[PDB]
Swiss-Prot record:
UniProt name for this protein: Histone deacetylase 2
Organism, scientific name: Homo sapiens (Human)
Classification of source organism: Eukaryota, Metazoa, Chordata, Craniata, Vertebrata
Chain residues that bind 1D-myo-inositol 1,4,5,6-tetrakisphosphate: 22, 26, 265
Domain of life from the UniProt record: Eukaryota
Gene Ontology molecular function, alphabetical: chromatin binding; enzyme binding; heat shock protein binding; histone binding; histone deacetylase activity; histone deacetylase activity, hydrolytic mechanism; histone deacetylase binding; histone decrotonylase activity
Binding site for Ca(2+) 2: 182, 185, 188, 217
EC number: 3.5.1.98, 3.5.1.-
Amino acid sequence: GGKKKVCYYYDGDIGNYYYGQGHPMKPHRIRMTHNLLLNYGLYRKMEIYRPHKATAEEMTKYHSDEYIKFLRSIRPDNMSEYSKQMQRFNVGEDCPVFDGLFEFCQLSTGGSVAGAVKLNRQQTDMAVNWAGGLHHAKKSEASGFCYVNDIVLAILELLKYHQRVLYIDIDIHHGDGVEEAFYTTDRVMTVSFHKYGEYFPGTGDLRDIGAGKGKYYAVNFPMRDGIDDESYGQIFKPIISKVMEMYQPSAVVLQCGADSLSGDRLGCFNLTVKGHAKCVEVVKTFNLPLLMLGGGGYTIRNVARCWTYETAVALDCEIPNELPYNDYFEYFGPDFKLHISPSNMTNQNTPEYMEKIKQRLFENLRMLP
Ligand SMILES: [Ca+2]
Ligand SMILES: [Ca+2]
Ligand SMILES: [Zn+2]
């Protein structure tokens, strides 16, 4: 399918937002990512855009007027005047109020949508927005560190020019927000691979398959602790292949949540950057308008490496394992390499389990026209 034109969305301000003392979600990781790919000379091969700030008008194409209205108003100075509404909208602990909250959502969202609009116009083959991928956010509620669901809004944009859009979610956590939004339609197929069993967000069972017009247009691959490169690659390509064959989308959205990497602070998977990036490689080969977003990721050196590498994969541009000098060079010790080693954790996902789940999803997929 040849080399592909990549467009890439980043706001220099994004790293300055702070969830608070001790919070694992660190918007700084995107700036590190940015700096890393810059120092590898990857700006030479792609177009760089600074997203606009998405507006409430844009946000309410999915979200309720009341919830956005709230997000626009809530500040740390005025919290105690909003306790009820906070509780209503699950803003308080997991999803803290911080300085610039709304603007952060605006910039996060603005890349996802600008990416979609760019793809809609047939001006890029791939769009990259690492600040996006906030799959947990719900119509009137924040969840799992996400406030505004940029993915959904982006898909609402793609649906303007595409009958069928494929959403794939390789974050360790289940894409409930996206799944939920599109649960009753066939215009969006959602595919989430994720840890399942006593683990946020609690949804994403094999048996969760959509409803109504959208029965079989939601697909879930529940996994256990310690999944590795061979196990993941054993099933990702076969499943993505069958899905492409049966569903035939004309646009793909790929959430590349990096918390599925080995050594993640909150994750319990054992993938490498290469294993992780293999997913991007597989979806790439299909040659469809492809929007790539971020998501989870809490060992921030590993997040930087992951998305740097995956941007380079978008570009089909080989980069050395020797990290170039960069503004965060010390975060990458003691090795200063691009690629990571798996840990020695047990893979609870037997080869047999992986084959069984895949055979069951195959059954489900036979049910499409
Ligand atoms: Ca997932
Ligand atoms: Ca669906
Ligand atoms: Zn996650």
